[PDB]
Ligand binder design. Sequence first.
Ligand SMILES: [Zn+2]
Lengths: 277, 49
Amino acid sequence: AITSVDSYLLSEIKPRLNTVLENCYIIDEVLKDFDYQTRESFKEAFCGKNAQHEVTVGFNFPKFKNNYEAHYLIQLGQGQETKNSLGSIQSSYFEATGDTLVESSTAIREDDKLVFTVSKPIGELIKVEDIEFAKYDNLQVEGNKVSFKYQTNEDYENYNANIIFTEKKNDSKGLVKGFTVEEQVTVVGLSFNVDVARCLDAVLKMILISMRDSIEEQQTFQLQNLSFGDIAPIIEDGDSMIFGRPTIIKYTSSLDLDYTITQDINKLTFKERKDWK
Amino acid sequence: FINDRGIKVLWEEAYFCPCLNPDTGHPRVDCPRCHGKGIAYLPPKETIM
Ligand SMILES: [Zn+2]
C-alpha cells in the first residue's frame, strides 16, 4: 500500500503511552535506574489514575499552544527508495487481500460442526491460535466463518481462540507493483523541566521496544532503527527554556499498488488447417 | 481625536475553529465555518481605527 509512518506512530504511541501512564509499577520498573527523587517526582506528577498533570502527543506546526510541561512532538522526516524488484513485481495474487487482522472468537456447535465466526470475510487464514488440525478434522473456511468437525472434538464445544487472518476485497487477479522505501520520523519529548525530558526519553524508548512486536510493524514498517540526539534547549527566550532530546525512528517499508489484470483465459482450442501450396 | 483621525473598519474576532482534527491537529480543508484557515471569526463589529 501507500503508507504514512507519521500517522502510524501517532496512532500507536498515544494508546500505549496512556496505558503505561495509568499503570504505576510499569513506570516504577522503567525508571529504576534514575535518581530516587526524579523517579518519585515523575511518578507522583504524571503517573497513575489520579495524575493531575498529563502528557500529550501530536504533530508539529499546530496553530495553538501546547502542553509544554510534557509533550511528544512527532515530525515526519526524510526517506529514499532502497531496493527494487525485477519488473517492480513486489508480489502477485489470485484474490485481492486486505489488511492482516487478529480477532478473539469462541467456538459454537452448528449441525455437528464446530464453527468460529469472524467479523469480516476471510481472504486467508494464517493461524487459529493453539490448534493444528488433522485432515480428519475436515477444516474448511467459507465466507466469514471457519468450520471444524464436531465428532471427535465435543470437549471443545465452547473453546475460546484468537484467529489471525486477512480480509479479502474482491475476487480478482493482479500484480502488486511497487518498491521498498527507508524513511525517518523524528520524535522529541518537550519539557521545561530537564528531568521530565529525560524521563520522557526513557518512556519513549520503552514504548518503541514494546512496539517492535506489534503486527503493524512486523508485517510492514520493518527494521526499526533508533538514533538519539543531544539534550538541548528547543526554545531559549521565554521566561524559561524548553528542553528536549530528539530521537529518530527509521523504518523500511513497501510502497505499492494493486495493478488488477482483467484478462483471463479459460479455454485453449486447437484447429488443423491444410496447406495445399 | 481617534474618531476624527481614524478610518471606519469592520472588526471581527478570532477564535480557533472546532473543526480541527482531533489527532493531527490541523483544520479540515472543506470546513464551511472557516475556509481552510484554522481560525473562525465572530460576526463583524463596526469600529474606527
Ligand atoms: Zn473549521
